């Protein structure tokens, strides 16, 4: 009993302290939505380099799977005023975009007419400050945003 009483106080302290630090941590480069957290590195990089940074950090490139997640990601894009790369590509099969796992998209917010594989060479995806998506050359540099 005794060991349980004081233990409750310790857990309550950790919960309160943690709740506070979550807010501190996310300000101003992160966004929490559901059980997902987006965090921007604050700089731009080509797709492959951006992908590697996220994977090595224990996460992956931003992969919005719902309107709510897309809106959260859009807030970071707007704050930095820099379009960002998403994790999805159609590098394997032209015209078919997939997540790093190979799974087909469960959500998309393409701007009208997109994806258009402009110049026959756009296999990556960027999200604009207006929240819309556009396929873009993977060699271009875009804001790095990872999800955890």
């Amino acid at each position: 009993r005794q060991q349980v009483e004081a233990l409750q106080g310790q857990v309550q302290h950790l919960q309160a302290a943690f709740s506070q630090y979550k807010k501190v941590e996310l300000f101003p480069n992160g966004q929490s939505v559901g059980e997902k957290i987006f965090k921007t590195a604050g700089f731009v990089k080509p797709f492959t380099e951006a992908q590697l940074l996220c994977t090595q950090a224990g996460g992956q490139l931003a992969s919005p799977r719902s309107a709510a997640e897309n809106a959260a990601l859009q807030q970071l894009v707007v704050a930095k005023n820099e379009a960002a790369f998403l994790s999805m590509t159609d590098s394997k099969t032209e015209g078919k975009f997939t997540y790093p796992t190979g799974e087909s998209l469960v959500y998309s917010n393409w701007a009208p007419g997109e994806p258009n594989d402009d110049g026959g060479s756009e296999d990556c995806v960027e999200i604009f400050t207006n929240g819309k998506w556009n396929d873009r050359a993977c060699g271009e540099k875009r804001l790095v945003v990872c999800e955890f």
Copy 2:
């Protein structure tokens, strides 16, 4: 109750280390309050919204101790910062976002002076002193949690 005690102990140690990492170099802990700067400047309204959306509010030092902690961030970035208080409701009366009156102040000599008949916001200098300033001006964004 045994293995659980070991987990809680580990969490306290891990959390303490993590807190130090988080606060370096843009945060300051004082009492139960934490100040954190965004590292950039914004006009008051925008700065205020950023803090509110983050689940906090603009820096609101309520004691000499809190003011000193906030001052450290201002000195580190060498950029004066906005406080949360304004006298937008009633000229000459500065209040917190809750309407409550100030329980602490550290005005520079002669301030607040509503210069130009248009200074309803407050900035804190690198010397820790306060000055009322036009809300349209851009100052370092520092929120409290």
Copy 3:
């Protein structure tokens, strides 16, 4: 109570996620140590003070593994960083802030050379190698916690 048990499990999961978020992109964990860069350069004394005030100390790689982890941050920022060690007390003998002699070193060929007759601090290059450098120079600030 089974209630506390469940709460702790979830706390561990939430904490683990926030730890990964915290380290991206300015931190690196290796073993029980965490390196975190301030993102800017400063002379040694100032860098040392920033780390000590934050409850840590300047980066002090004690193994090849720790050196590699630190190297990642230096490469990512593309800026050589200061280590904690100096030979200010006894020329030629580098020590940690505590006074203890080095237990690991990764000197670049020809180093340390005390070039100019006054290089008592240490910097780590993007290639991971070390070079003794004048303490007055400005290098990337990286602390360990």
